[PDB]
């Protein structure tokens, strides 16, 4: 990574994210630990810990062509200029020098580093989070409509069932406000379902889990 | 977090706090945990933490309900300004980027940083606490009212569960004083309640587990 | 801690804090251990290890009844001092201020660093090291009067459980002195009873084990 | 490594390359985590990873005969000058120079510290991974023609098998590109295949999975 | 420790210390482990690695014995002078200020940090590496004169059984010259004995074992 | 250590090597691992490294005869000088001095410190390292000449048993270069035999174990 000047990436760092793949597969948390072991890298480093990963070779060609996209809507969207590049300058970055493909240890430092600076670690980080969660998506068992509380089951467990659910869902802010403001007490067992209607439409989660809770 | 320059969050911090969620689920000691693994960090470094918990969804629900109170407290109590930023300056807080929502690590980096300076690390750590004080509150088995010595148990474990029972409890540090004052002595079992009742109303716990150790 | 300036309590130090509750329980060790992992820190970082054990509740509440009693000789003995305090100076710390509660971390930083200073940390650390000491003797299993050695327990043992035992005692040098100048050879068996009566009253342990090692 | 000044390769990144080898045989990661426990290592560094190595011992063969060529190869395009070597100047790496055979750690620290340096870290490195990436073909089970879907699989699974294969053969970019633009769907089940054949030949692995999720 | 500023002992360095004790007892090697464990430390930190100690207590006695004899031959071979310290110097250390009993963390770090240094830490090292030599002297099952190889062990065995009772033997490099000279040949089964006696007084080690290797 | 200051070697670094020798005992790679756990390291260290090592005591005497001999060499091919030394100078190292035995930690920092320096950390790392390889030598269950390829063995295990058993043999380049040249397809089994032979003496190994894979 680099913290200014450029470290490696640890053994711990990238072990944790290959312990990180191997037990939580593609889950949820899996992008923000990434994130995290991510933070600060280079186009290498995140191209270093894309390659530990054994297994998983599907969902890796999937994020490569995400990366493929985002790397030419980049090249389009950022017309290369034809010329000598100057002394005090550098040159200019494609989607390929953002991906760690044709660009150098070296030239990832200078566009980081070197002022008027072009972040292309987390350039690359945002088009590999892109495709991470495509995956998610791609990998998720249920949908929100499905989540439905049992004659049996407490409110609690119900309530998280259904807000992992709705974490794994592809939709805007206001379609999970929506899917919130509707399916949680829609989709409630007759008891707590009338319970929670009885409360009213503007009653927090705690009020909810609070009054459904000896239920 | 922060240390003055920038650190990203480790993977063993992250890991720890990970770990700590996963055995100890929602006891009071994961808040304090949490508060050292946090200690310096970045509205950034905290959604890390947050986010690295899978499972648990409801009460994350709960917690970012709560996040969304305090942060509009904090925006009718600080009514941004129209105007265009001074170059030596920065921009105005908002609820939600205090919690990281609309706002860059640069920017976070900026308000804790720069001088006259806001700690939105601080801030949200605790809007995030006090959400979780809700949580420790809401999965808390038992009540101090129900805390009875048994005829064969040891004072020892009667008071062990009495000051956990009461470290879960909800109230002001008079409503606990007043709990020690009368509950204790009061709800232990008949020998040990005669030999408290005959130490007097001004005795120590350390004088009181004496009384009671061969009993 | 502070090592000059202010670090963050590390998630190993704390990790080996709580384990070394879990594990030791309240053994003499603990202590020694415990002023190892807290060794230049604020009474925040104390105030996050002694939080940071679950359950030990009982134990916990002597140890603060302790802490309340020394900060209320502290404050007897050092009385606050009316009026505005200058701008090169800091305020007069309470016991309160010493014990983390009424006090921030930057005034804790303050009066650790700032000259003419007041260690904070380490009275805190001497009133809590007190109610542990006080802990480590209310749950000592033995008393010295009754270590008696066995038939046929080999002499090493035999010492091995005396030391710990004295160990565990609550006693001034001069009060130990007079248990090992007395009832080591008192209460060991006939056999090495007799050889120890026949080495001396200036015999060092050392010459004591050796003699008594093939008995 | 060297990181500006030159530290020691650590214990754990050491022990880290070794469980790699033990557990991972020789599948593709080795080579990136290898990079990555390498980064910025001296030819003795590198020499001591490899060296590391207990069985295995005819790859590493394969491995030195490798780097032999690779240094001859060096050596005939890099022809050595006769000579006194000037003050402010270092002699010419002959090929056994990149390998660490004849050369001292300060030799290394020279050429890749002193200015218009030569990276013999990277290059040495370079050839390493050469070697490396024959012996990863070497050991390959399968060859990408063999990949073909089950009557009974799904299709994410034959996906994994078929870029797992696909990442160990030894084949140019467009190959590479011609193999998953015909075997692919070529060789899926009778099923998927005729789904795959019914949405075209530009459709991205992922419309290929979500059509054939089902099935 | 002290490294030049001073650090807290790690909780790694005293955890290793701790296991090395439980697991190793008082093998000769637990000395060298110490003694690399507490490398440039105060008495402060040597008293805690001591001290961190559970159980043993009867070579903890036998030790502080030792530190108190080293501690009085200290006393009265520096004889203290009376008089007011001038401001530039330090107080003349006590024996029990070598050991730390009478002594603070800061004036220890004066000693071994102020001119004209006084290395306490080494000093009081010393003497308790003379204890604990005293102690694995005490706790050795085995003299060198009760080793004498099987009449079907492999010279090898015999040569680690003598190697490590003639480590853990108190005698000058003389008398462990002689026991090599003369017990190792000598106790010999007869058949590696008369090969022995055949290659002659001044035959290494090595040409033993190789003479020995087949038999 | 020496990195440049004197650092402690690190309980970590010691650890590892305690392991290293209890679960490899003394094959090839121990050398290596040795050589890089110790790197930078002073007399003082490597002395604490071989003194950690519990059991092994035969291989550590005859070490530490290897030892004796190189230091006698270096003391006949440097002859001391008599006289002062002189203030801004050292004194004249003898072979005790780089093993360790009669310098202090001060001296052997002063030796690799002080300008016109002798590496004697490195001088005493080549004598232990020149007896750690008389001990593999000596511990080498197996000889060179011995490795037959079994009639059902498959040729890259032959291979693994015989670089292996050659990377333990006592020999020059030269040496090892004939036994690769001779013995290799000389001890294969009939049938990889003569594929070999038909492939030519000048076949690279890559080019052999293709040929011998079927088979
Ligand atoms: C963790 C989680 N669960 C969900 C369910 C539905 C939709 C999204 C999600 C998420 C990701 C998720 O929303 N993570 C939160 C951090 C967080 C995690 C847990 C509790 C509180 C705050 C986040 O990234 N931000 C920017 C945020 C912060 C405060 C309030 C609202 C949002
Ligand atoms: C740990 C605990 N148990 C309780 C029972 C009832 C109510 C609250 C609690 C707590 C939290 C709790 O009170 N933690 C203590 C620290 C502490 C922990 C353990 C022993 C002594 C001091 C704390 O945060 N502060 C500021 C404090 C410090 C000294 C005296 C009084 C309070
Ligand atoms: C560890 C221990 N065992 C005891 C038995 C009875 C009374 C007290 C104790 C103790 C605590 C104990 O005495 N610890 C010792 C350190 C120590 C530990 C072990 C061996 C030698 C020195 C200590 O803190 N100091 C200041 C000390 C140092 C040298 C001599 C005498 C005292
Ligand atoms: C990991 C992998 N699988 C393959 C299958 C066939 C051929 C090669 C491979 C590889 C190595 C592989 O291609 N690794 C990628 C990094 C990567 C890994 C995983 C997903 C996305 C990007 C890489 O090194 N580079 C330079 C790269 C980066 C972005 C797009 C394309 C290439
Ligand atoms: C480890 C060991 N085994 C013994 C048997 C009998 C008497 C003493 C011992 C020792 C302690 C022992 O002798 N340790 C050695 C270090 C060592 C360890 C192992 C092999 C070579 C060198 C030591 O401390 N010094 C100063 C030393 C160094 C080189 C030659 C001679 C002595
Ligand atoms: C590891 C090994 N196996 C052998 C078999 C027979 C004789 C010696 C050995 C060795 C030690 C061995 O040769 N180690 C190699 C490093 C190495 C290890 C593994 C593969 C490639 C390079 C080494 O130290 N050097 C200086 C070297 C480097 C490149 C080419 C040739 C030699
Ligand atoms: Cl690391
Ligand atoms: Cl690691
Ligand atoms: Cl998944
Ligand atoms: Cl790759
Ligand atoms: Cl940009
Ligand atoms: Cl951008
Ligand atoms: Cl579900
Ligand atoms: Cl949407
Ligand atoms: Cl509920
Ligand atoms: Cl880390
Ligand atoms: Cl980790
Ligand atoms: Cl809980
Ligand atoms: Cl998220
Ligand atoms: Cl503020
Ligand atoms: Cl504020
Ligand atoms: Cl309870
Ligand atoms: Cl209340
Ligand atoms: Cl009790
Ligand atoms: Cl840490
Ligand atoms: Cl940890
Ligand atoms: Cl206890
Ligand atoms: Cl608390
Ligand atoms: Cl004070
Ligand atoms: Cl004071
Ligand atoms: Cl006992
Ligand atoms: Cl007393
Ligand atoms: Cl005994
Ligand atoms: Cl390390
Ligand atoms: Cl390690
Ligand atoms: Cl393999
Ligand atoms: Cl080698
Ligand atoms: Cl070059
Ligand atoms: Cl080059
Ligand atoms: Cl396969
Ligand atoms: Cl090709
Ligand atoms: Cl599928
Ligand atoms: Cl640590
Ligand atoms: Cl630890
Ligand atoms: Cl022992
Ligand atoms: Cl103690
Ligand atoms: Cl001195
Ligand atoms: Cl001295
Ligand atoms: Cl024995
Ligand atoms: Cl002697
Ligand atoms: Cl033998
Ligand atoms: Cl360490
Ligand atoms: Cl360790
Ligand atoms: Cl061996
Ligand atoms: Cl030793
Ligand atoms: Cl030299
Ligand atoms: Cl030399
Ligand atoms: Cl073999
Ligand atoms: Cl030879
Ligand atoms: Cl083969």
Not at 23 to 52: C, H, R, W, Y
Not at 152 to 159: A, G, I, M, S, T
Request: proline share 7%.
């Amino acid at each position: 990574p680099i913290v200014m000047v450029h470290q490696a990436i640890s053994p711990r760092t990238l072990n944790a994210w290959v312990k990180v793949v191997e037990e939580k597969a593609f889950s949820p948390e899996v992008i923000p630990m990434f994130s995290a072991l991510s933070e600060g890298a280079t186009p290498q480093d995140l191209n270093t810990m894309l390659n530990s990963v054994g297994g998983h070779q599907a969902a890796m060609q999937m994020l490569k062509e995400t990366i493929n996209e985002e790397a030419a809507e980049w090249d389009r969207l950022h017309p290369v200029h034809a010329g000598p590049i100057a002394p005090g300058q550098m040159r200019e970055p494609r989607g390929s020098d953002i991906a760690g493909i044709t660009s150098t240890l070296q030239e990832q430092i200078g566009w980081m580093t070197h002022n008027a600076p072009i972040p292309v670690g987390e350039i690359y980080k945002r088009w590999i989070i892109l495709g991470l969660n495509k995956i998610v998506r791609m990998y998720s068992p249920t949908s929100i409509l499905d989540i439905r509380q049992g004659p049996k089951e407490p409110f609690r467990d119900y309530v998280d069932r259904f807000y992992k659910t709705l974490r794994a869902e592809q939709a805007s802010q206001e379609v999970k406000n929506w899917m919130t403001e509707t399916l949680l007490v829609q989709n409630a067992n007759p008891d707590c379902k009338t319970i929670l209607k009885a409360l009213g439409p503007g009653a927090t989660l705690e009020e909810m889990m609070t009054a459904c809770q000896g239920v």
